[PDB]
Short mmCIF file of C-alpha atoms in Angstrom, two decimals:
data_model
loop_
_atom_site.label_atom_id
_atom_site.label_comp_id
_atom_site.label_asym_id
_atom_site.label_seq_id
_atom_site.Cartn_x
_atom_site.Cartn_y
_atom_site.Cartn_z
CA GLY A 239 25.84 22.99 91.36
CA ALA A 240 26.21 19.21 91.50
CA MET A 241 24.47 15.87 91.00
CA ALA A 242 23.42 15.79 94.66
CA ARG A 243 21.36 12.90 96.02
CA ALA A 244 18.11 13.92 94.33
CA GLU A 245 16.23 11.79 96.86
CA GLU A 246 13.07 13.57 95.72
CA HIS A 247 13.87 12.83 92.07
CA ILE A 248 13.85 9.13 92.94
CA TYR A 249 10.07 8.83 93.16
CA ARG A 250 7.37 11.32 92.18
CA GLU A 251 4.75 9.66 94.39
CA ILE A 252 7.02 10.05 97.41
CA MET A 253 6.62 13.78 96.83
CA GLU A 254 3.54 13.45 99.04
CA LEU A 255 5.60 12.63 102.13
CA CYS A 256 8.94 14.10 101.04
CA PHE A 257 7.13 17.43 100.70
CA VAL A 258 6.47 17.43 104.45
CA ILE A 259 9.84 15.94 105.39
CA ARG A 260 11.53 18.75 103.48
CA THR A 261 9.78 21.23 105.77
CA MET A 262 10.93 19.64 109.03
CA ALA A 263 14.43 18.62 107.96
CA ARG A 264 16.47 21.12 105.96
CA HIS A 265 18.76 18.28 104.86
CA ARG A 266 16.85 18.43 101.57
CA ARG A 267 19.23 21.24 100.64
CA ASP A 268 22.21 18.89 100.90
CA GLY A 269 20.36 15.81 99.68
CA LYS A 270 18.82 12.98 101.68
CA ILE A 271 16.35 13.93 104.41
CA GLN A 272 15.72 12.52 107.89
CA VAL A 273 13.27 13.25 110.70
CA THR A 274 12.02 11.66 113.92
CA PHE A 275 8.47 10.40 114.38
CA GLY A 276 7.79 12.99 117.07
CA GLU A 277 8.85 15.82 114.78
CA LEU A 278 7.04 14.45 111.73
CA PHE A 279 3.80 13.93 113.65
CA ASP A 280 4.03 17.33 115.33
CA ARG A 281 4.36 18.68 111.79
CA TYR A 282 1.59 16.62 110.20
CA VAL A 283 -0.79 17.42 113.05
CA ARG A 284 -1.12 20.88 111.51
CA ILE A 285 -2.10 19.29 108.20
CA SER A 286 -3.71 15.85 108.37
CA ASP A 287 -2.32 14.35 111.58
CA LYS A 288 -1.54 10.83 110.36
CA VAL A 289 2.07 10.72 109.17
CA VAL A 290 2.45 7.19 110.52
CA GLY A 291 -0.47 6.16 108.33
CA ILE A 292 1.13 7.62 105.21
CA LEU A 293 4.49 5.99 105.94
CA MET A 294 2.82 2.72 104.97
CA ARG A 295 2.53 4.01 101.40
CA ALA A 296 6.22 4.91 101.14
CA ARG A 297 7.21 1.63 102.78
CA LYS A 298 5.73 -0.10 99.73
CA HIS A 299 8.94 0.88 97.94
CA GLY A 300 11.21 0.57 100.97
CA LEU A 301 11.57 4.28 101.71
CA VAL A 302 11.15 4.15 105.49
CA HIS A 303 13.84 2.43 107.55
CA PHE A 304 11.63 2.84 110.62
CA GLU A 305 10.93 -0.20 112.80
CA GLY A 306 7.73 -1.69 114.17
CA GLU A 307 4.25 -1.91 112.66
CA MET A 308 3.41 1.54 114.01
CA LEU A 309 4.60 4.41 116.20
CA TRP A 310 2.78 5.61 119.31
CA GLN A 311 3.12 9.33 120.02
CA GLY A 312 5.19 9.84 123.15
CA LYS A 313 6.44 6.26 122.96
CA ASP A 314 7.91 5.61 119.52
CA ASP A 315 8.91 9.27 119.19
CA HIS A 316 12.51 8.02 119.31
CA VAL A 317 11.88 6.31 115.97
CA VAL A 318 14.16 8.05 113.48
CA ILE A 319 12.65 8.13 109.99
CA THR A 320 15.39 8.47 107.37
CA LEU A 321 14.11 9.19 103.86
CA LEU A 322 15.38 6.16 101.95
CA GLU A 323 15.48 7.22 98.30
#
């Protein structure tokens, strides 16, 4: 029992993406969450298959520290997306 990071308690809207990020990265248990593009995509592919497209929404509030205007599967997979909340 502690205050934790409550990264998810930072923004309700983010719940849309955070919900998926919490599945890939178990860091949610400790607090902040982080996942690579490759992993995220490979996880969203079984849902909507457009994580990169959703990231644009979260970026509106500076939640994605990712770089570039987009990420190409197999190319920008190295892109590490760290939930900024």
